[PDB]
Structure 1
Amino acid sequence: VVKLVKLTFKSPVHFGMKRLSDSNHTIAADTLFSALIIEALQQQLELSHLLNNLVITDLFPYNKTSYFLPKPLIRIEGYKAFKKLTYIPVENYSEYLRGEIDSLEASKIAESLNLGKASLSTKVSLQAVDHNGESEPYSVGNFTFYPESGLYFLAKGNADTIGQLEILMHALQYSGIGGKRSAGYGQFRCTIEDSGKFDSLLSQTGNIAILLSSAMASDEELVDCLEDARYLLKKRTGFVQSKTYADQLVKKKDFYAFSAGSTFYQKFNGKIFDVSDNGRHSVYRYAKAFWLEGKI
């Protein structure tokens, strides 16, 4: 049951990737899945159903005109335009797979992206000033979406799983996503509806397969899938965000996952991984795979 979820962000969002200064326009599926898990914990909702039966897609840009998917990692027989071309409208993406997209149209598609503007807020901490100290400045990354634009993701699951996702997203609207939430950022409104277009892209048969979410297979699946693939291996690191985990905040175990949009000739099922070390509760990372079939 593929459901399109569209997030329109009222206030700017941080969506940090490596620091507080930098801001990402989107987030990977692991971040959204962690937010869903946190929300289910707050709402006293079971985690097993969400962990097992739910496979979600990375968040991707969309405008009033087009919904943008990640550029597939396929061989190109100029190249700077394709490097600049990160997202392709779904109708254009099938043409890109067919290889009809030239460099000029690639640059035109890349400039067509009007997701929003990335800024940097400069803030201070005045806590030391009271205790005979000096204030200290810092910076928070931000990304403000244009009024028509927003982010979206596709989620597949059982009917009960979809309803639980609806409730969790209704709560996440006010909980927020990204960094420096509960400090002025990350507030969004969500709308979940079935999308015929996405279902048409979902149902497809091709020689090649492309990830829609950041994922990594188990070793047994890795042996078969790794061969004949073009992928980007991205590191997923972070600090645990919980009160129950430890007395003081502890970093998560470093993970490495195939970036969304990577092309595998052999598909692999995803696995929910545990990046906890010596903690009171296991810290979950989402590495399940959302697949699109294409022909090159």
Structure 2
Amino acid sequence: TKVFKLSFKTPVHFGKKRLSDGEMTITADTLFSALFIETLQLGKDTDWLLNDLIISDTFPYENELYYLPKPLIKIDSNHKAFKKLKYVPVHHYNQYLNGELSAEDATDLNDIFNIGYFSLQTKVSLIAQETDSSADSEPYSVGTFTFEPEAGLYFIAKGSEETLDHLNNIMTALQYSGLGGKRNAGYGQFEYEIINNQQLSKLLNQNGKHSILLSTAMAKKEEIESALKEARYILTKRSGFVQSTNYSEMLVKKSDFYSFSSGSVFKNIFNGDIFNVGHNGKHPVYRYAKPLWLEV
């Protein structure tokens, strides 16, 4: 159960809906997809790395601070500053759950949150009839994000030791390919470091009555009734396309799927599952929904 930390040195585009849209963090779905396809490019055995690996969503970090997303618990007071905040440092993570975080404290934390910036890159396309004959060029836009020199992303993983070694190898291999969006266009390379934060390790090693879903998950058919007993949650529509499956890419697109977001609180833990979103393809296409809980 080691955690990986990522550095890019070149901006990467994530994106939610349109190429000009930009993001800082990705969900476990994309990471699982990318790691899987990288395994397939290496051509190793997927079953081991199919139903044994547990991954968190990606999370931003700064020079020396690690953060987690905001738990959607019901705090009874200001209800303005707390809305604007997304991420919490580990220093006061349990303090916020208790209620020690002050409104001015939230103000301060939010102030420190400068961990990158967003930008729009313009690109022009002359593959059209602009060069061939009488026509115009095709400008379009992309959205990219530039992390600070000591800023990047990290995930929290758990599984068997053999699973961890395989993940290590695959992560190395992927290091040089991309992630995010326009990988081949010059965005999203990375060098990674495995660091063990004692405090975060403790954070994973608590025990309590609540539990914070850190990944993008959704229980099976036969667990949902008992899972949804007392929860505070957000649904997050996940859509997207697929790579080297059927003849027409524009014809291929995994069906819109829904999962809980990454700040929900649950009473009854559920194991998740890797759901097939496949239809009319030459292979099954995997979307990831399996939780990693922080039990407090």
Write out per-residue CA displacement over residues 22-63 of structure 1, whole angstroms, 9 at most, x where no aligned residue.
111010001000000110000011111111110000000111
2:45 corresponds to which letter in structure 1? E
Residue 168 (structure 2) pairs with residue 169 (structure 1): no
**What SS does structure 2 have at the residue aligned with 1:53?**
coil
Q: Identity of paired residues, percent?
A: 56
CA distance in 1, matches of 2:253, 2:270: 28
CA distance in 2, matches of 1:43, 1:191: 21
**What SS does structure 1 have at the residue aligned with 2:97?**
helix
1:94 corresponds to which letter in structure 2? N
2:186 corresponds to which letter in structure 1? G
1:43 corresponds to which letter in structure 2? L
The partner residue of 1:270 within 269, 272, 275 is 272
1:222 CA displacement? 1.0
1:100 CA displacement? 1.5
Q: Which residue of 2 aligns with 1:33?
A: 32
Does structure 2 retain, via aligned residues, the 8 Å contact 1:58–1:212?
Answer: yes
Residue 60 (structure 2) pairs with residue 58 (structure 1): no
Q: Which residue of 1 aligns with 2:119?
A: 119
Does structure 2 retain, via aligned residues, the 8 Å contact 1:208–1:263?
Answer: yes
1:195 CA displacement? 3.5
CA distance in 2, matches of 1:194, 1:101: 26
**What SS does structure 2 have at the residue aligned with 1:51?**
coil
CA distance in 2, matches of 1:171, 1:19: 28
The partner residue of 2:198 within 196, 202, 216 is 196
Q: Which runs of 5+ in 2 are unaligned?
A: none
Does structure 2 retain, via aligned residues, the 8 Å contact 1:3–1:195?
Answer: no
Residue 73 (structure 2) pairs with residue 80 (structure 1): no
Q: Which residue of 1 aligns with 2:46?
A: 47
RMSD value, Cα: 1.1
Q: Which residue of 1 aligns with 2:238?
A: 236
Write out per-residue CA displacement over residues 141-173 of structure 1, whole angstroms, 9 at most, x where no aligned residue.
101100111111111011111111111111111
Normalised to the residue count of structure 2, the TM-score between the two structures is 0.96
Distance 1:131 1:80, change over 3 A: farther
Q: Which residue of 2 aligns with 1:101?
A: 101
Pairs aligned (count): 291
Q: Which runs of 5+ in 1 are unaligned?
A: none
1:191 CA displacement? 1.4
CA distance in 1, matches of 2:203, 2:256: 33
Q: Tell which deviates more after alignment, 173-182 or 96-105.
A: 96-105
Q: Which residue of 1 aligns with 2:92?
A: 92
Q: Tell which deviates more after alignment, 135-144 or 188-197.
A: 188-197
Q: Which residue of 2 aligns with 1:153?
A: 155
Q: Which residue of 1 aligns with 2:3?
A: 4
CA distance in 2, matches of 1:211, 1:169: 24
CA distance in 2, matches of 1:68, 1:282: 35
Write out per-residue CA displacement over residues 206-254 of structure 1, whole angstroms, 9 at most, x where no aligned residue.
12110111111112221111121000110110011x22x1011111111
